[PDB]
Design a protein around this ligand. Structure first.
Ligand SMILES: *[C@@H](C)[C@H]1/C(=C/c2[nH]c(/C=C3N=C(/C=C4\NC(=O)C(CC)=C4C)C(C)=C\3CCC(=O)O)c(CCC(=O)O)c2C)NC(=O)[C@@H]1C
Ligand SMILES: *[C@@H](C)[C@H]1/C(=C/c2[nH]c(/C=C3N=C(/C=C4\NC(=O)C(CC)=C4C)C(C)=C\3CCC(=O)O)c(CCC(=O)O)c2C)NC(=O)[C@@H]1C
Ligand SMILES: *[C@@H](C)[C@H]1/C(=C/c2[nH]c(/C=C3N=C(/C=C4\NC(=O)C(CC)=C4C)C(C)=C\3CCC(=O)O)c(CCC(=O)O)c2C)NC(=O)[C@@H]1C
Ligand SMILES: *[C@@H](C)[C@H]1/C(=C/c2[nH]c(/C=C3N=C(/C=C4\NC(=O)C(CC)=C4C)C(C)=C\3CCC(=O)O)c(CCC(=O)O)c2C)NC(=O)[C@@H]1C
Ligand SMILES: *[C@H](C)[C@H]1/C(=C/c2[nH]c(/C=C3N=C(/C=C4\NC(=O)C(CC)=C4C)C(C)=C\3CCC(=O)O)c(CCC(=O)O)c2C)NC(=O)[C@@H]1C
Ligand SMILES: *[C@H](C)[C@H]1/C(=C/c2[nH]c(/C=C3N=C(/C=C4\NC(=O)C(CC)=C4C)C(C)=C\3CCC(=O)O)c(CCC(=O)O)c2C)NC(=O)[C@@H]1C
Ligand SMILES: *[C@H](C)[C@H]1/C(=C/c2[nH]c(/C=C3N=C(/C=C4\NC(=O)C(CC)=C4C)C(C)=C\3CCC(=O)O)c(CCC(=O)O)c2C)NC(=O)[C@@H]1C
Ligand SMILES: *[C@H](C)[C@H]1/C(=C/c2[nH]c(/C=C3N=C(/C=C4\NC(=O)C(CC)=C4C)C(C)=C\3CCC(=O)O)c(CCC(=O)O)c2C)NC(=O)[C@@H]1C
Ligand SMILES: *[C@H](C)[C@H]1/C(=C/c2[nH]c(/C=C3N=C(/C=C4\NC(=O)C(CC)=C4C)C(C)=C\3CCC(=O)O)c(CCC(=O)O)c2C)NC(=O)[C@@H]1C
Ligand SMILES: *[C@H](C)[C@H]1/C(=C/c2[nH]c(/C=C3N=C(/C=C4\NC(=O)C(CC)=C4C)C(C)=C\3CCC(=O)O)c(CCC(=O)O)c2C)NC(=O)[C@@H]1C
Ligand SMILES: *[C@H](C)[C@H]1/C(=C/c2[nH]c(/C=C3N=C(/C=C4\NC(=O)C(CC)=C4C)C(C)=C\3CCC(=O)O)c(CCC(=O)O)c2C)NC(=O)[C@@H]1C
Ligand SMILES: *[C@H](C)[C@H]1/C(=C/c2[nH]c(/C=C3N=C(/C=C4\NC(=O)C(CC)=C4C)C(C)=C\3CCC(=O)O)c(CCC(=O)O)c2C)NC(=O)[C@@H]1C
Ligand SMILES: *[C@H](C)[C@H]1/C(=C/c2[nH]c(/C=C3N=C(/C=C4\NC(=O)C(CC)=C4C)C(C)=C\3CCC(=O)O)c(CCC(=O)O)c2C)NC(=O)[C@@H]1C
Ligand SMILES: *[C@H](C)[C@H]1/C(=C/c2[nH]c(/C=C3N=C(/C=C4\NC(=O)C(CC)=C4C)C(C)=C\3CCC(=O)O)c(CCC(=O)O)c2C)NC(=O)[C@@H]1C
Lengths: 266, 172, 162, 172, 162, 172, 162, 172
């Protein structure tokens, strides 16, 4: 997005990224750059050890035996990808990782989860991975020669608006990676077809003044609450409390039986 | 909240403009409808309990899954909450009618209601159905020609229908 | 963590399959090997100090410059000798893990992944560690399947360094 | 994921220690149980389809609300998903039995499953009931003395029961 | 085909890795099993006709409408009875391949993949074949390791059909 | 890919025949060789780096034109690529030895390699020479009688030599 | 082959753009540098025999075991000294290319890419070449921009080796 | 791609020799021409839209069949593509001028272009004619003596003319 919003949201570097295409008669440097970009994208920006590199697939790409899309698929099917993102993750976390890594977006609806859980149950891991790379969405955005890149922060034809808000759950900043498994932050909002506020970059910040206690820190607690006391006006609530009152607030929420969905510094 | 008059005022102040003759004339016409507005509010209010309970009974009859064990309206506590929500919505609809502006209904009642209902598992589409039943009963009551000076309330009745429709659309 | 049992499940899980005779056979291969692996691990463990000391000395002998030359990367002082014996001990300890686990997983994860970057950054020669591993091969005193498996891990580390 | 062996290795490496003679003996004792472990895995696997379908039939007979129209297992897609979940849980339990460590079951199957079911409105208590039915049929299949070298499998059977119990706890 | 040796290499190749101790243990696991598998294959092969004939009759006994109803999918005429015996013969023969290969590979490749579509298209009940497979489990006369491996493949097919 | 067992299965299936007694006995004979097969794979693998590095030094000594400026093994990338290719070929020969069938080596490594090298300008004949040097050192390593239960490994050594010859013949 | 002129076009081509003032300013940057680079390349080239022999002896002095120890990787014989002298000459010659090209392109393409594997496979210590490159840095006699650009490439090679 | 410098380096490396004194002097002469090269790139770039649109207009006037219904540049998508191709070629011509080597133009623009046009049914001879018109206007623009330090640019103009001629030949 434009500087005014991208700066607040921590996505300036994403906005200025340029799709990388492997051209005919590319140099050795250009192939090297492409291999690096694929590893960064498909492996979610993990530090890649030399022992983990796909020696053979790299050779074939460099020899123009296989396309960039073939090389993306080789990496996605590799044991490295499996160990990083599949063997230690629940399925729905695995699926959103595939959407981030391979399509550069967040899942749009629960039925995408259902489709891919069914496909894994039917044809296993390879069939699941191939669905992303062979999809119309992959072919029309990246084709055979362009390295995948994150798309979720830009208006895409045939996207859902909530794809933009959800992007911030799966993209956590430039200096981040999908390395620790874990659970999906998207589970509830996918299942119930809703959206969640975007607290990223500097949008989590809230004013302190003289009301933020001894450490001048506020914490934002997002809860789901019901009336099991004073009247509850909203099923979803946020509380801003200082560090000194944070234990009391948790205990209050806990005593009321309400669910904490997220807590972060404000 | 805004009423029919302050709504026009707020727009004019932002433009730095006196209200125009046409706008003043439009408000004059609103004033001429006042007695019929008042009567409609009084008629819905006077029948509020019947409207809510009949709509609720009709709703549960058509959607028995709501009150079967495990249903969202099952147990006294959830049945009570459900009846309260029906009353709440009807009440704010009457507020909007009284003020002649939807802002009270939108700000105080509908804003966030879909979000509340999804978060807590309340079947919004069933709330919408009940609202529609309350709409039909209230409009019948408003339109009843007995015991009232005869006249044409179609404009106020249309405005009231718009408020119920907003309420139904907001919960689903 | 490459290991016979984890490999079998990893494959089956990737395929979304129950375990079949292929995986059961893998488990039998493990069972045939496990006791010898544990015995080798016990024998290396009990002899850990002598093996590490001997190996470090074998390196110092084959590369005398490492004891004579100043520098953070050499063993002229006690500090460097400590680091060196510590390193060789890491190699030995993790090898015992491989015997317990039944695969190179422990070497892969704990030691080998990224070793090239360490040796280059801190200017450590792989040939030093190759000698240490050669000594351990020549002096762990194991026999039979315990010898064969333990050597396979010692040679795996050697090949990874060269 | 960890197996019974690498579980001990990982703990030892974090402490920078060789495995103690006690730990090696305990692992040697694990090896001595290896054939029973394989047999239990083979037996459960050979009866997977019967185990799942029988437990599913019993579950729906015991809990008819699941398959009434509007129920969570009504419609072919949801019924198919339900049968799939039963099969998935059984499959990872066999994995954990095979590896002698729960990590595969916990990481791949149970982690976040409760939240998934709550989010979707899948009745987790019913899933737990289904798991319990699968467990009982599984352990009987494992313990059947017919057509197998006779011996005491009580330890393996207890370990397997622990995996089923962990699954049942997790979903509800 | 999915067998202990090819899966070992396939995994190793994808990692660009030489075979290690983990794969050697898989090979040992295959060797422990091979002779019993070859003995099971010979025993099933020698009694193939008896097993196939017996299994086919078991199906007819349990599903008598198959020999009484006119239709392309039934065995009321000599044509169908021959189709049926052929099919049961296919199951039996491919099961012997699995015992030779040491995995479900042959069943997956030649019979199971696509069987759902075949049975649906030609209106063949998978319950028929389950019964034939159960008969074979009950009459092949194997014991010990040979019996365990054979039944795992028969059950693998049975589970695939249900 | 095929292994020694599934190679026979696939042929038998193509004819719709059970394996003959002669074929099963042949397979049983292969099983008897299994330990020697495993030892040979282990020995080559344990010396893979030396086999490659010594073979490469010997090749560049006999064929110095490869490593002079403008030569095909000149510059670090080409030298590293050349050493990689040698290790790849050796790796696939050990796969073929391990499986007891040449398909993995042929399907994955050799098929198309000649044409690939021709297009790159890689001298296929020099590659064959290097494969020969690796073969000679590899066979000596397998045959080392020290440290192993003595026996006749002539059959397994002949098979391994055949795999090297396939590789050599496929590049030149 | 990274150089200012190719990088400018590569960037613009990736964007489907005509060259703009940005790329023009890169060219001016190249021009400002090119004459000094060409002067450095001549100076290095004319003294190459001396710099290479001097650098090699500096390696031999700093690491005397390289001239005393038998082994293919060491220079205790004439064969190794010729190999060592050749290798240092490669570094110097390719460095003069970087001065001509105005970037590290030549070092990246011809020398750096794959050097880790070579040194590891043939058991050559990168410290030897670091010392050789350090000798050249102190003995090429350049000043001004020719010195600064030339040292950047020698430093670039050193950082790649460490 | 190569530039005028790396072209010499690459040839030198294949021979394993330092650049000769005359090769360094020749590159120095290239550097002395750098400002004129930059000016010519800037001048063509500044007029790119005019160069393309004028040449295209001239081409269609000279070759009316192209734009008649059924002609190759008929329909907006085909006309759009035709204009794009003219600009692409001009853009890559400037790239080659900027770098001082044709490799960029040949590798990234002209490679495969004849086959592309043959497959599409684009008249390559008409493309070559349009490139000639762009060449003509470009060289006049580059030689425009006003508003620029005076000097002899004939060498750079010849080099540019060569790149245009290269493009025209590649299609025709
Ligand atoms: C549509 C709403 C129906 C309708 C209404 C209607 N009402 C009037 C006029 C009046 N109604 C009142 C109301 C009240 N007087 C009171 O004391 C109270 C208690 C607080 C109330 C609610 C009044 C004061 C009037 C004005 C005097 C009169 O009696 O007429 C009209 C006539 C038009 C007007 O604006 O005066 C109308 C049309 N009539 C219908 O037929 C609809 C079913
Ligand atoms: C509890 C699980 C039941 C039980 C088990 C049990 N099994 C054995 C021994 C063996 N079981 C096997 C299994 C297989 N051999 C094969 O070829 C295959 C197919 C791949 C399988 C699954 C083997 C190899 C053995 C060892 C040889 C033997 O036949 O004895 C025992 C004996 C103890 C042991 O550890 O060996 C036991 C107790 N026994 C029961 O009574 C439970 C119902
Ligand atoms: C030709 C290859 C050389 C040769 C081999 C040879 N080996 C055996 C027997 C065995 N070799 C093994 C191997 C291993 N056991 C392990 O645990 C591992 C580590 C993972 C390995 C590699 C085994 C288990 C045996 C059987 C038991 C034994 O110790 O002998 C033989 C004997 C014949 C047989 O089939 O067993 C032979 C001939 N012998 C030579 O002389 C060649 C130089
Ligand atoms: C043939 C191409 C025509 C021509 C060119 C020409 N140019 C110069 C000299 C210069 N031109 C520039 C250009 C720029 N300065 C900037 O700041 C930018 C904007 C990004 C540009 C494009 C510069 C810096 C010079 C040097 C200073 C000067 O003005 O002299 C010359 C003179 C010789 C030289 O090589 O410098 C020439 C000949 N002259 C003609 O008559 C042709 C029509
Ligand atoms: C115009 C009346 C107001 C305005 C608009 C504005 N919007 C954005 C950015 C985005 N708008 C959307 C919305 C959608 N994308 C979709 O795909 C869909 C349909 C499914 C919708 C509804 C999105 C996702 C974005 C962000 C991503 C993108 O920009 O492509 C901007 C740009 C903000 C920036 O900083 O770039 C603007 C300006 N702005 C106003 O001031 C008006 C009130
Ligand atoms: C070293 C002084 C300290 C230390 C570091 C350490 N970091 C990680 C892991 C990661 N570091 C990063 C950071 C970045 N990645 C980027 O791309 C960027 C630039 C934009 C940065 C700054 C990331 C993303 C990771 C995670 C991904 C990955 O690990 O591959 C580790 C590894 C932890 C682990 O293995 O789990 C370590 C050890 N550790 C210390 O103890 C020092 C104080
Ligand atoms: C029986 C003693 C007398 C009687 C009963 C009667 N009840 C209703 C309607 C309702 N009954 C309930 C009660 C409950 N719902 C709950 O969830 C629980 C807590 C677990 C209780 C106790 C409710 C909520 C209703 C209204 C909604 C519904 O119909 O379910 C009726 C019908 C009333 C109507 O208007 O439909 C009747 C007839 N009536 C008698 O005459 C009996 C002596
Ligand atoms: C009845 C037709 C349906 C139904 C209702 C139902 N609602 C709730 C809970 C809440 N309803 C609200 C709504 C409001 N509270 C307010 O203060 C206002 C603003 C003026 C509104 C609009 C809220 C906030 C809640 C949550 C807090 C509370 O319960 O008071 C429930 C209970 C949910 C639960 O299980 O806790 C129910 C049952 N349920 C149905 O099945 C009908 C379709
Ligand atoms: C009738 C033609 C024959 C027959 C029927 C029969 N069906 C079942 C069990 C089930 N039937 C279904 C079907 C559906 N469930 C759905 O949600 C829908 C889509 C909306 C369909 C079509 C299912 C899912 C079941 C299993 C679960 C359940 O019981 O609800 C049975 C019993 C099977 C069992 O094992 O209990 C029977 C008997 N049987 C005949 O012999 C008839 C010719
Ligand atoms: C059956 C006894 C009960 C039941 C099940 C049920 N589950 C879902 C949906 C999901 N179940 C899972 C779980 C997994 N998927 C995996 O891949 C794995 C790991 C390998 C697990 C544990 C998931 C992820 C989903 C959501 C995605 C999907 O739909 O596939 C449903 C469908 C829910 C819906 O809204 O469609 C059902 C029906 N339901 C019952 O009523 C039984 C008690
Ligand atoms: C070394 C003894 C000889 C030599 C080798 C050499 N090879 C290449 C380039 C390639 N080699 C391959 C081969 C494979 N890649 C794979 O992944 C596999 C397994 C499927 C094989 C068999 C390929 C594909 C290439 C091209 C791509 C790449 O460079 O990685 C080179 C490089 C040539 C160049 O860069 O132009 C060299 C030097 N060269 C000799 O002179 C020796 C005889
Ligand atoms: C000198 C500082 C020390 C030394 C050198 C030495 N090097 C080798 C062998 C090789 N050197 C290289 C290096 C390059 N080849 C290239 O193409 C380039 C890029 C242009 C470089 C930098 C290579 C690839 C080899 C191996 C192949 C070959 O034989 O040429 C040796 C011999 C190693 C062997 O095993 O034969 C030696 C001796 N040795 C010392 O002791 C010096 C301190
Ligand atoms: C008429 C309303 C005004 C007008 C027209 C005008 N058009 C051109 C030139 C072109 N017109 C087109 C349009 C099309 N070509 C197609 O193939 C199709 C789709 C089927 C369309 C709509 C094109 C492509 C051109 C350029 C090429 C050509 O000349 O054919 C001109 C001349 C422009 C020039 O520079 O020659 C004119 C005059 N001009 C007016 O002033 C009218 C008000
Ligand atoms: C215009 C002077 C003439 C003309 C052109 C014309 N070209 C096309 C289609 C394509 N042109 C290209 C060429 C390139 N694409 C590239 O990316 C580059 C290298 C960077 C080049 C040189 C390609 C690939 C196509 C096809 C794909 C595409 O159009 O994007 C057309 C359209 C053909 C059609 O049938 O649509 C046309 C019309 N046609 C004339 O008549 C003029 C002589």
């Amino acid at each position: 997005t434009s500087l005014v919003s991208a700066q607040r949201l921590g996505i300036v570097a994403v906005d200025e990224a340029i799709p990388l295409e492997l051209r005919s008669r590319s140099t050795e440097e250009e192939v090297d750059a492409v291999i690096l970009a694929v590893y960064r994208q498909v492996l979610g920006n993990d530090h890649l050890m030399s022992q983990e590199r796909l020696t053979s697939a790299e050779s074939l790409l460099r020899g123009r035996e296989i396309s960039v899309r073939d090389f993306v698929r080789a990496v996605a099917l590799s044991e490295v990808y499996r160990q990083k993102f599949f063997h230690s993750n629940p399925q729905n976390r695995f699926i959103e990782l595939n959407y981030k890594h391979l399509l550069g977006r967040a899942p749009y609806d629960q039925s995408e989860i259902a489709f891919h859980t069914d496909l894994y149950h039917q044809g296993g891991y390879e069939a699941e991975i191939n669905s992303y790379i062979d999809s119309v969405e992959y072919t029309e955005n990246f084709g055979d020669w362009v390295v995948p890149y994150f798309r979720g922060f830009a208006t895409q034809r045939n996207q859902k608006t909530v794809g933009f808000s959800r992007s911030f759950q799966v993209y956590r900043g430039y200096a981040t990676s999908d390395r620790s498994g874990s659970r999906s932050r998207l589970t509830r909002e996918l299942a119930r077809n809703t959206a969640s506020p975007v607290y990223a970059g500097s949008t989590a910040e809230s004013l302190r003044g003289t009301s933020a206690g001894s450490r001048n820190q506020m914490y934002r607690l997002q809860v789901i609450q019901g009336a099991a006391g004073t009247r509850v006006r909203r099923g979803k609530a946020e509380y801003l409390v200082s560090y000194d009152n944070l234990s009391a607030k948790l205990q209050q929420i806990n005593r009321q039986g309400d669910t904490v969905t997220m807590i972060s510094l404000a | 909240m805004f009423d029919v008059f302050t709504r026009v005022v707020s727009q004019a102040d932002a433009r730095g403009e006196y209200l125009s003759g046409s706008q003043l004339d439009a408000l004059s016409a609103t004033v001429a409808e006042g007695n019929k507005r008042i009567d409609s509010v009084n008629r819905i209010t006077g029948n509020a309990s019947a409207i809510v309970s009949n709509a609720a009974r009709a709703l549960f009859a058509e959607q028995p899954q709501l009150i079967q064990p495990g249903g969202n309206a099952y147990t006294s506590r959830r049945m009570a909450a459900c009846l309260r929500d029906m009353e709440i919505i009807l009440r704010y609809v009457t507020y909007a009618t009284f003020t002649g502006d939807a802002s009270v209904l939108e700000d105080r009642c509908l804003n966030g209601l879909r979000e509340t209902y999804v978060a807590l598992g309340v079947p919004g589409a069933s709330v919408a159905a009940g609202v529609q039943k309350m709409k039909e009963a209230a409009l019948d009551i408003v339109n009843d020609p007995n015991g009232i000076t005869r006249g044409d309330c179609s404009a106020i009745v249309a405005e009231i229908a718009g408020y119920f429709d907003r309420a139904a659309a907001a919960v689903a | 963590m490459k290991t016979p049992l984890t490999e079998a499940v990893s494959t089956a899980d990737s395929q979304g399959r129950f375990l079949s005779s292929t995986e059961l056979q893998i488990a039998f291969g493990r069972l045939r090997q496990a006791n010898a692996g544990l015995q080798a691990a016990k024998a290396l463990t009990d002899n850990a100090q002598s093996l590490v000391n001997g190996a470090a000395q074998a390196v110092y002998n084959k590369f005398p410059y490492t004891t004579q030359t100043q520098g953070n990367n050499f063993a002229a002082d006690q500090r460097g000798k400590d680091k060196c014996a510590r390193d060789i001990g890491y190699y030995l300890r993790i090898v015992t893990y491989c015997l317990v686990a039944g695969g190179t997983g422990p070497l892969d994860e704990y030691l080998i992944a990224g070793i090239d970057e360490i040796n280059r950054t801190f200017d450590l020669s792989p040939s030093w560690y190759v000698e240490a591993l050669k000594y351990i091969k020549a002096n762990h005193g194991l026999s039979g399947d315990a010898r064969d498996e333990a050597n396979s891990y010692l040679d795996y580390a050697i090949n990874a360094l060269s």
